[PDB]
Point group: C3
Chain length 269, copies 3
């Protein structure tokens, strides 16, 4: 079944690694610098991994040491706007679960709709809105092997990990924001009317990923921490043209702070 696929994937991964990570990190598009801070023990290209989706817009699974602990890092992820199903988008999370990963740190780039946000701000995700997503990764003809049929979503981002983020940030003098993330499919950016409405719904930041992974991670009983880099501002009255290159550059600008935050958080787990 899906269980047999996951077994095959994890068996392949276990044959390459000797570390036993209990922590996993999904790096957002344009946020690969963390891998430089990582003492890399094993590198596994996505193309070699059984049942992983082929050819992402290379993709690498890295196993090594960070903040004095064993971690697995996904460099590259699968996006719904690339034409992957939600099951493919979230397959790596199921794999991390079966590897024994208990804590998942997810980062992404997002548009800031909160008026106090500036480009390059780091925003801890304390909640999300998932209801715009057109396909749900939990819709399966059969009940789950692991977890509840109808998982509770009253705390999808674990409070202790949010508090830890803020503790570390205060200690390192990293300004840190928090708020509600809303997932859209993309790939087109949002209209002015859309930004206005999303803000009115209570969203602080909008992005094109992450939420499916967090849903699956919570259903599987993992502890999740999520963080957005604010790469562009989405104030509809003063909205200008956004450009992928500027978004990537802005993401890169914030990476040193993000890397430092994440390393020190892991160090403290």
């Amino acid at each position: 079944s899906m269980f047999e696929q996951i077994q095959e994937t994890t068996q392949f991964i276990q044959s390459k690694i000797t570390l036993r990570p209990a922590i996993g990190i999904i790096l957002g598009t344009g946020l690969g610098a963390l891998t430089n801070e990582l003492d890399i023990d094993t590198t596994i290209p996505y193309e070699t991994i059984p049942h992983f989706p082929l050819s992402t817009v290379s993709g690498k699974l890295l196993i090594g040491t960070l903040g004095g602990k064993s971690v697995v890092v996904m460099q590259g992820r699968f996006h719904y706007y690339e034409g992957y199903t939600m099951q493919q988008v979230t397959y790596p999370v199921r794999v991390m679960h079966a590897l024994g990963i208990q804590t998942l740190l997810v980062s992404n780039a997002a548009g800031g709709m909160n008026p106090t946000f500036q480009t390059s701000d780091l925003m801890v995700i304390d909640d999300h809105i998932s209801l715009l997503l057109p396909q749900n990764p939990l819709i399966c003809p059969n009940p789950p092997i692991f977890g509840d049929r109808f998982p509770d979503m009253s705390e999808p981002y674990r409070k202790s990990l949010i508090d830890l983020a803020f503790s570390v940030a205060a200690e390192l003098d990293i300004p840190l924001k928090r708020g509600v993330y809303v997932s859209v499919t993309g790939p087109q950016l949002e209209t002015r009317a859309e930004y206005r409405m999303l803000r009115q719904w209570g969203a602080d930041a909008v992005g094109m990923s992450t939420v499916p992974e967090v849903i699956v991670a919570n259903q599987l009983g993992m502890d999740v921490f999520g963080i957005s880099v604010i790469t562009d501002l989405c104030f509809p009255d003063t909205l200008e043209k956004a450009e992928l290159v500027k978004i990537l550059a802005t993401a890169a600008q914030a990476e040193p702070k993000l890397t430092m935050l994440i390393r020190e958080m892991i160090g403290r787990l």
Copy 2:
């Protein structure tokens, strides 16, 4: 076509029954007690019915007498979160239509977002929000054999049936609420941010069913009455973990009142 399938299904059902019900009832998950009040003339397991979807999370069609009238009762229904298409979810409604059912009573369990609601409250559905549903049961390459191409939805829950509910409830001293139901796919429950936004949109109760059936029933010209059992409270500031067992228990608590209400309504039609 789909017409030929429906014929085959109804032909099979007609071969088992001798009653001529003009009233149909869809029982929500965790609300089977009504079948005890039913004088059952015929029992038809879902697994034996041509073109019905296989294996629900048994499923029975019961034909008998309730409130002095012939009725058909669906014990068990098909949910989008179980992986059925919207066409499969609503196929039983098309079948009831072709059987000659004119009045449809639909019940479900829902989360209460209206601050005056308490667990076990009965809420008459006076309107719904369907726009979060990711697939629409009316999207067909061919125009419908029965009904309008673009059906009006200014009164999806017939006023006379709502008034009747309230009349019966006052007479039996059953407290009765009313409000707007919003359908989500699930199967995960909603986040705090999601509950806040849904309430802000004007929803009173949120559930994972019913709306597709009501859309098809209205398109087919049937009279619909809908009622939710409030099984859990969804006030986002004071939200606690929900559990399937507690939701089912709460549903069961409300069933005697619901059964009494429904029997006396049917008695009065």
Copy 3:
């Protein structure tokens, strides 16, 4: 690929035509009268066009002269509620692009939710809400041959074309409204609760088309102008039953003004 299909389609069209239109017009359902004002040089039934979707609820591509300029007119379009994929819905726009069309004028019928709107009003679309659409025409496994991967949507309806509309309308004494259009799938009309919520989101008019085309046109770098005929009023407190025949009749009522507006706009380009 999709590129080869488009080539085949355009090659077929080029073999029938001798004009070189740089302007394209998509006529909304119930708004065919513009073709009477058109000096028709070539008529191409949809059924003969390679890779066009078969059998619409005839369909014709007309090439001719209007407002002293060469134009292509789509009489008949493909709707998501008819069971076509979003790729099929927007294929004609890709074809117009490959024909060299730079300016696209799109018209439709819509329900008016702005309290100042009356039936037969013309409303220029100055922005849209696309996030209810369940499938996105840009979700492709491969990056686009033309355009950006993540197109900006800060100005999906070109300001100069909106200003031109208003200039022409003032000159011809045509009252003209403007506002935000929201796309829904249909085919059922909206409930009272839905009209209330859509208005609250900031929509002025709601319809069952157009947005997919505008997204693709903008991604392909075309200039878009959009206009709705308000065919029915959607004030939820005073909502009455809508009927397709009355909607079509109302659309027809507004056509002379719309045709005059469009001809004089094209004349001025």
